[PDB]
Write a protein that binds this DNA or RNA. Sequence first.
RNA 1: CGCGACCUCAGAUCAGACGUGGCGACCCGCUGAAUUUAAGCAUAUUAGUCAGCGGAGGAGAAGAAACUAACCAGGAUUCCCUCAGUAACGGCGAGUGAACAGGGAAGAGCCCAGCGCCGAAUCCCCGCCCCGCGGCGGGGCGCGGGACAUGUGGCGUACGG
Lengths: 86, 120, 122, 105, 203, 50
Amino acid sequence: TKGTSSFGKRRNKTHTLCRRCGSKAYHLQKSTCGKCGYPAKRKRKYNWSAKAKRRNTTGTGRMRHLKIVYRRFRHGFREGTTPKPK
Amino acid sequence: KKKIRTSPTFRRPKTLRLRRQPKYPRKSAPRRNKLDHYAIIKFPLTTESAMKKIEDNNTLVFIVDVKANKHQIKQAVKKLYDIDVAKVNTLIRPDGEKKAYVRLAPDYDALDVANKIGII
Amino acid sequence: AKIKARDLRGKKKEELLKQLDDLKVELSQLRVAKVTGGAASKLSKIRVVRKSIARVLTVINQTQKENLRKFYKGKKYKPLDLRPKKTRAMRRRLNKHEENLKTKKQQRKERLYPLRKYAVKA
Amino acid sequence: APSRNGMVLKPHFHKDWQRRVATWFNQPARKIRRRKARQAKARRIAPRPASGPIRPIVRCPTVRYHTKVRAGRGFSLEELRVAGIHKKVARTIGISVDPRRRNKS
Amino acid sequence: GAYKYIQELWRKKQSDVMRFLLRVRCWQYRQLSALHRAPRPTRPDKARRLGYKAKQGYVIYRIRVRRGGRKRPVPKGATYGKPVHHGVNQLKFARSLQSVAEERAGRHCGALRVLNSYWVGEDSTYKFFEVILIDPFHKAIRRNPDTQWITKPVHKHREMRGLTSAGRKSRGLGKGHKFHHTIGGSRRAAWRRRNTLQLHRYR
Amino acid sequence: SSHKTFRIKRFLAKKQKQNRPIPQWIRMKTGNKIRYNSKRRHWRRTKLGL
RNA sequence: CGCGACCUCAGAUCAGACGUGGCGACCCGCUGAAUUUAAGCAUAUUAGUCAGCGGAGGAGAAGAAACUAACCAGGAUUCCCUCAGUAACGGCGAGUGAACAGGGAAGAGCCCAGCGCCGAAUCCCCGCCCCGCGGCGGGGCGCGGGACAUGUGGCGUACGG
Ligand SMILES: [Mg+2]
Ligand SMILES: [Mg+2]
Ligand SMILES: [Mg+2]
Ligand SMILES: [Mg+2]
Ligand SMILES: [Mg+2]
Ligand SMILES: [Mg+2]
Ligand SMILES: [Mg+2]
Ligand SMILES: [Mg+2]
Ligand SMILES: [Mg+2]
Ligand SMILES: [Mg+2]
Ligand SMILES: [Mg+2]
Ligand SMILES: [Mg+2]
Ligand SMILES: [Mg+2]
Ligand SMILES: [Mg+2]
Ligand SMILES: [Mg+2]
Ligand SMILES: [Mg+2]
Ligand SMILES: [Mg+2]
Ligand SMILES: [Mg+2]
Ligand SMILES: [Zn+2]
């Protein structure tokens, strides 16, 4: 009986957490992320979902290295020098 | 004559494999051991179950790092508290830190060790 | 008894390590006091000792790194954290010597036909 | 539907034009940009004559325009020879050789 | 004069000497594997007139391509809709087999630059090309002018952006009335320029 | 279940550590405009997707 | 029934490097529909477009004629105005549709192979010390190794040499 009892029988998960991208879309039998495409090297990305592209593009996260790159670009990527101590 | 193939299978002949003698180390210095004894032991636990374990089973109980195993906990306790440790039972709490019970050797006494530590 | 890096930069590594490990002993005692209640004075010196530990470890790592730079000064192959960092593409690009390399034909052209300076009168 | 009387028109608007609509709001800005580029170039080649080499006289190549004359790409090697100068020192001086033009007159 | 003799000999492809050599070398390239490194150019005059020099940092890769047309990769030969788009079998790829040989060589040795390529015998089933690759980080190459342009970073994957000799022949661009389709630099540059609408400020 | 893996235990540890009311000095902070923790989870009402 | 030389291959946690992935507004290479319009619909149109795949850079591509033209001739590429909704394509229906000349913006030109001459003149790597370090070279020294005549460098490329 296709409704409430069939809801009763639901106790085996299809997806678990993914090591890349952290979403709960890692298909356990298929061994593949439905969100990011992982076991594969290239990230799953499609132009037919601009909402998905903006949900996980560069800038929605922490951007540690990139904010340091922006600062260092503004100063010219200098290294090994000191602000001439007092 | 006198070299003879006594097998129908050609195998890849084993060759010399030199060890590495690099021109420079890939990193400068060895990395600092960031899991030293002060990192191992974070603080003692001073709950009522803790006090029961202290007065009954000659055992202390600490909150320790998640990465530390029983050998590191025992060595760290024996070093920075200068005692001897009978055994170590560890669990991980539902908050996510490792609670370690450490039972001392019988010639030592958990009461006066806790008095020297200051949790008493 | 507050410690400053300008006073830390003259010590030797035995007393630097001694200072470091007595600071860590004091931090352990302060956390013991924090669990056992202690006092607000101790709870406020926690942050002071932690920043002092950060200061001491900064000074040790900086001294060791500049000793490494002095040792690898003038060497042919330096470690990957001692060679410069700038940007992967800037590391991939050519250096100034092989940029300014020129052929004998093209420098012969440059010697024979230099671009003159001139004005045209009205 | 045609109303009464009019032209039969064929507007070429069947092809998703309004993604490739190009506007000209940056026209004054690019005029300013080209102007200051010319100024920078002139004061870079400060004594050199500010506009480029001398160009030759060139007859426009069609029975519609073959009465007029205009500036060409460059002088040719024959007339450089009759002028008596070398085809490399000419370009260092400012003469703008063009090797592929012929002279049939 | 030697290279001129080799050049005339390689133009005489239907002579008995050349047809023997082509058949035996085709046999052994067939027995080898699909992507392969040659130790030296088989055709040195062709390789040097295509750009190769006998220096450290020029390598030669032999690529084998399964020849024939392009079949439409649709299940059970069923495209859907428009009989004009119902075709499956007699379709043809827009690029040449030589270009896809260069593309496979570049994609395998992705740290080298594809300079050029030439033909070294086909088959009925395969086609064999040799691709000149350049290591752009050998000193003997970036410490010498007239060849560090390929070490410059705008020349990564020339064979994938279509701008080797074979890929350019596939793009079909030139000068004159034969080539109006690509008269803004490329085909879709021309399409863009003649399908945009210039809406001026003062119309 | 009682049979867990270490990383699902870590996940649940984080979730129950952050299922906690807001402190009361936060409301006395200058320019606060936050009255209560608005993303508190109840185990019976809203389930973890895990 | 051995010992060498080359060729063609293989192995190595060998010495030193390089590629991978991301972003993708613009660019390049492919692949590539159907809604739609034709008052139906199949060619046509939508459209070489969306979706799909690959590769970049601060721009990219293109580019110094196997060109335009038929004139008293012009003279690389790119872009703007015009040519021009034109020549032309098209159930010649619906629809589609450029180029040259002209006026401007910009303006820059060059290099191999081959043919030939010069005792390979050429290039890479490793030690010695000297002059430097701060994107690491200069020259000298080595009865030091290799690449290379199955062709490196200099002259020289259709405007001739
Ligand atoms: Mg299943
Ligand atoms: Mg256990
Ligand atoms: Mg030369
Ligand atoms: Mg159709
Ligand atoms: Mg429920
Ligand atoms: Mg190695
Ligand atoms: Mg219809
Ligand atoms: Mg209708
Ligand atoms: Mg219908
Ligand atoms: Mg697309
Ligand atoms: Mg990439
Ligand atoms: Mg370019
Ligand atoms: Mg180009
Ligand atoms: Mg008109
Ligand atoms: Mg069309
Ligand atoms: Mg001008
Ligand atoms: Mg030569
Ligand atoms: Mg030419
Ligand atoms: Zn994932």
